[PDB]
Amino acid sequence: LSCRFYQHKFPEVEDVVMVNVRSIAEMGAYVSLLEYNNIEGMILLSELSRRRIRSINKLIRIGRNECVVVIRVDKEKGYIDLSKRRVSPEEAIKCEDKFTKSKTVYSILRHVAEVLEYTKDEQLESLFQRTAWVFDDKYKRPGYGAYDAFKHAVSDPSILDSLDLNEDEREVLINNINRRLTPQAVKIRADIEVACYGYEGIDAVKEALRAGLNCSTENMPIKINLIAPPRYVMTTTTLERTEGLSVLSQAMAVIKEKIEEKRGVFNVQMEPKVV
Amino acid sequence: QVPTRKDYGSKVSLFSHLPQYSRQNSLTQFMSIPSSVIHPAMVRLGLQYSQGLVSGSNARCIALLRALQQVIQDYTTPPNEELSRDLVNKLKPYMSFLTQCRPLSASMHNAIKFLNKEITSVGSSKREEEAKSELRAAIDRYVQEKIVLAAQAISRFAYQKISNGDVILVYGCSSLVSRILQEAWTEGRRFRVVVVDSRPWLEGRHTLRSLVHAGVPASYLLIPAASYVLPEVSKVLLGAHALLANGSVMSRVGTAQLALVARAHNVPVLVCCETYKFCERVQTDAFVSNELDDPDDLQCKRGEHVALANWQNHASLRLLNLVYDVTPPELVDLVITELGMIPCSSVPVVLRVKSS
Amino acid sequence: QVPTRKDYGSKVSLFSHLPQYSRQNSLTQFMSIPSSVIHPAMVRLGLQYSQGLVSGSNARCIALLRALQQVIQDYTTPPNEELSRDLVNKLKPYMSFLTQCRPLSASMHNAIKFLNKEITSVGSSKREEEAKSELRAAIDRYVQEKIVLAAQAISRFAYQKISNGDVILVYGCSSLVSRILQEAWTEGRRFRVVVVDSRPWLEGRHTLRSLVHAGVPASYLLIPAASYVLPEVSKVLLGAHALLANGSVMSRVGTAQLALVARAHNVPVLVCCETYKFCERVQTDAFVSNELDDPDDLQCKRGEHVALANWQNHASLRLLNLVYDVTPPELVDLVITELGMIPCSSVPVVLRVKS
Amino acid sequence: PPPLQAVLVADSFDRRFFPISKDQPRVLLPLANVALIDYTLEFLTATGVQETFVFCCWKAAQIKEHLLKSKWCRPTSLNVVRIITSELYRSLGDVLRDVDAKALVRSDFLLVYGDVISNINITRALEEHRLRRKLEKNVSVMTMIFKESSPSHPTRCHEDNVVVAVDSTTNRVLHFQKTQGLRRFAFPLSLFQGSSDGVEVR
Amino acid sequence: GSELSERIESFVETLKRGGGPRSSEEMARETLGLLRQIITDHRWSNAGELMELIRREGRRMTAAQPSETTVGNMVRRVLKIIREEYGRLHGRQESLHKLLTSAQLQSNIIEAINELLVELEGTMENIAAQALEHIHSNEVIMTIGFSRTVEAFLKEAARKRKFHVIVAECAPFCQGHEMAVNLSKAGIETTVMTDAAIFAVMSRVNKVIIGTKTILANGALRAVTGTHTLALAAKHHSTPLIVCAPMFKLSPQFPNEEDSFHKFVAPEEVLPFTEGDILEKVSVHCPVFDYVPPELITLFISNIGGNAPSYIYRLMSELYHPDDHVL
């Protein structure tokens, strides 16, 4: 049903780790290590904050997840002690990114297991040992390696095929990765009123529109439609919105230059934006 | 595990949430004679609480601390475990069972919190015998400084207020008040004492037995007649079972009545209590947090007939036996502690300075 | 037989001993169109009580006495009978029906008692027409000398207590207070008046509309803001719907609240009332005997919604709108009657001297 | 939904303020030490107007100078103000004809004089007007704003009293007229022949 | 930054024009976020420079709407945090003892502000967790107006206990009716009354639980209109009164140090415009805030526990600096 995200069982010291608070005691706060198959953990009260704090409940908030560093580990007694004073905002950000990517990877693996109908928890543990943790061991970078490998598999299915799990299981995993690691959807729209009330009005307007549309490269066809008489909407349904905005800006600049050259009228009704 | 004590008799609707047991029903009837839950430091204290062998709050705290010293001495760590946390996790059932036998007081709550803090403060590297010895030493130091020295300092402070030829009114069996009066009489102060008692405990007679044994002139009367005797009373002195952060005084049932009538008769009111008894929790009435004792103690034999004999056979009839009540701060003029002579409004301030 | 009125809505547990009728439900649906069980004057008066067309205590008493005069004029004794007790026996169901339409007040209770005492005192040797004329004359004399002359004397007495430049606070709608203020202003005094109102009747706008028409400066505000304006108030004048024997003042809902807040602000409180409203019964609070109005009056359309529209649909929801409450005597300083200005504890003495 | 716009005429085409108007525009008179233009601009800004056009003909120089120093003319204001000057203006009809000639408005603009004191949020009325337009397919062209008031109020001066007759079901105006000096009012039969369900005279 | 100025202008316009955000908790969170952005996205070298900038922004925001004190309280809290951080990073209270005995700051300030937001998040649950110890079975609890804190308090209390709640509508803004439905949606057997009847019913009320808008230094309160009357009735009947108030509602000001303490709105709500002629002479006042003296307050409940009014001066002294009461 569920297991630790990483093959490693006890996280090392000085490693920022996600926790979920469960209860409050005198010694400190009880948490579950969500990504280590919910092992019990402690946060000492003397380490909650650098300031003088009298109540644990001032920042415990049972039921709310948190990012805590590990200050001491004792594998013999199953005792892990954590901390909140040491963690920096940047460390929290990178740990949260790690947690999100690990959650995505585990969602993919859990979907694969459910598709395979592997009712045995041992079968799911073996699935973790074989399918996803192989890339984790290969890349020598826990967390990020699995997500990078899954992205590459969504790009090139060679990585997914290289796994030695099964044939039908490989197909199920590929389908799950495609349904999960390929959520590409974007449509950048903009509005601009291009019209020249001069001698060759319609001709100049058509020429400027064609010149602007000529800047639309492959996999980014800028289609211009006449929503109104004087205003025109340009739509480019392409991924990479960061580059799409620059492309739309370049097209708008080209259209404005073409309109100004022929002594016409060009107005930017709205900047490019997603739909 | 330990069973649950059965509530005895119907309760008032306003007090439906509080438990109410009977002295006849002892929980030990459902527990092993060679106590298998844990060692029987539980059962001795629990029986002496349920049967009311010890009543005074200081007496209860001392008995609990002695029993818990025995607990610590007999306790041994399990392999592959940490004492600083296992000790508290094991001690929590002791507190649960003790609450089942009889609800705890503020003094015992403070003692439990202090000992839990001490256990938590114990490091994970020190040896077992050293930890046990230092825990026992800490308990001894706590007892000493929080009871004996506090009582001596409070007696020294109260010696100033007690003037010659005056009348001092007390209430119930309180060790601090009796010791204060005895020490004041020792130093040559000449005065009278008026004792006010209330049913059904009638523990006020206790202090009377002290006062005659100290040669102090005394007088004794029940609570309702207090309004008759107050005009000749010059000072009212009351012990307290607890102090709250709002300045109110949680004490025996009759304390608030005496304070109110004393204010109505223009008589100063003194409340003597130790700092360790101060409790951070607050309440505005005796309904939210109290303790209902056995109602069967209410039955009395007047003439040859007991009116409340078969009270259970009347469905509409209800009996309540309150043991605690709250006196509002505005009716209190003194709190006498080892820190000195303070107003009630300064109760939280002490809680701030003793916490660190 | 007269049918009983059915209670509307679920009443509060503490007020289970009081009725609660809706304005929509009227008994006339189950009565003969040509009135036979009761006199047409009685049914008309009950209709205009149950619909709230008459609100003032003095107005209610005057209307009741006029309707009773109409009935007396229309009455005819039966054979083998005499007027003295037959009249009262015939009148009792009319009073029961009137109570069914809306609970009686102190003024109506006193008027009924006085009329019963007068009818019972009618000699047997009296002739029917002569007895009817005498009853009509007695009712007219009672109305005159117990409302008009009483109000004139009360206004004359209260004129002295009002000085130039002071601020007077009133509450609700009451003919006596408005007459006092208008006559005091007419006599030459100069002052401001602060009007305090309350939901849902909002009857204060009545007396305000009078004061503006008299040229008196005025100010208006709801009851909760009274504590804001009491620092600048010098005197408090209230109208009382009933005076109890123990000195308690049985009046409109907000009277006791205003008296308490005024006493906290150290402002004298004045009460003007007529002797005929002095009841002999006593009550220590507003729970033992009160009046429950239509609960649907509490609904107010704030914004675009009525938050209490389907209040019945919530099982654990109850609405409560009292009409009367009791002010303890310690919060009152004056009772102003035709007898003069008396302490609030002298009410029983007057009760003794009027019999 | 295009951004909302509002036209703000800054000249009353009527000489009701001689000799005050002879040396100061009416729109610039201080009501409470604040110009009426400031009041109406604040009201427009409050109700969410993002573009406001002010037309000024009489003594437009003073209005220009005063407005350019106002808060609304600051670059931080969300109410973009555009000032138009034309001495050819003689009535509001000329102003609207000029607006149509230059086609500043796109759809659903606000018409209001420069001496209007108000704090009305017309979001509800705007939504109702747009819904009526959408369902009825461009039949309704105007939506007046009216406030309930007793006829005895001082604000209802005899110069600007108006009586209206509308359908109470859809707020569809049927008749509208002034009541200056008229002791009786007239209503054509047509109002009843169409809306047989009911008519309310206000 | 341009966007910083844009957000500041939007915030001050929203505060000065009407309401927003709906709950004072959201307003405090937005103020703290704006102050954090000011501290981060601005240039400053000395602590004095940052304090002067914060003081100017706080003066502007307070001048936007004086009746709203939460923004000022947050600004003063930030100023106190800056003072403490500078003092303990450079060196190491105004008491008698003091009388008789004479580079990386920004990250620490940001961390402290984040801690402040974290403890702001759970304030309502911290208050509501201790409801069970203040309510007994078959109690009668009376409430005025609308308050989310009291709503959550009563909902948490009613989970394991049965009692009766009587709510008085706060005319003219009859927001108590929301209680009337909301508690009814939880099945708490509530009753609705007009606020002209408090004293009349007050003798049958075991306890009164109310919220508040502001807490002053001496322990007074700024509450909804009519709360002074309710407190007076409670004192008359000696019924204990509870003020469920979060920690961030302690203004270090004093009652009579200023005016405009009351907030006046259009008299349309009290008296509708349709009256006509009588409005031409009648003066109408509609204050929406009332002053409650500390004598009538029995207990304060906050996210840190219960307290007496007489102790308020300490808490105000533990969150602000005396030299910042002028701002």
Author numbering:
A (entry chain N): 3 to 277
B (entry chain G): 166 to 521
C (entry chain H): 166 to 520
D (entry chain J): 40 to 241
E (entry chain C): 8 to 99, 106 to 115, 127 to 351
Task: Tell me, in the authors' exact words, what the paper reports.
After the recognition, eIF2 is released from the ribosomes as the guanosine disphosphate (GDP)-bound form and regenerated by its specific guanine nucleotide exchange factor, eIF2B, a heterodecameric complex of two copies each of the α-, β-, γ-, δ-, and ε-subunits. Sandfly fever Sicilian virus (SFSV) evades this cap-dependent translation suppression through the interaction between its nonstructural protein NSs and host eIF2B.
We also analyzed the mixture of human eIF2B, unphosphorylated eIF2, and SFSV NSs, and obtained the cryo-EM structures of the eIF2B•SFSV NSs•unphosphorylated eIF2 ternary complex. Most of the ternary complex particles contained only one molecule of eIF2, but small fractions of those containing two eIF2 molecules were also observed. There are no notable structural differences in eIF2B or SFSV NSs between these two ternary complexes. These structures revealed that SFSV NSs and the unphosphorylated eIF2 can bind to eIF2B simultaneously and there is no direct interaction between them. The SFSV NSs binding does not seem to affect the unphosphorylated eIF2α binding, because SFSV NSs-bound eIF2B is able to accommodate eIF2 without major conformational changes. The only exception is the quite small closure of the interface for unphosphorylated eIF2, as observed in the comparison of the eIF2B•unphosphorylated eIF2 complex structure with the eIF2B apo structure. Therefore, it seems to be trapped in the nucleotide-free state. The binding of SFSV NSs sterically blocks the inhibitory interaction between eIF2B and eIF2(αP), whereas it is compatible with the catalytic interaction between eIF2B and unphosphorylated eIF2.
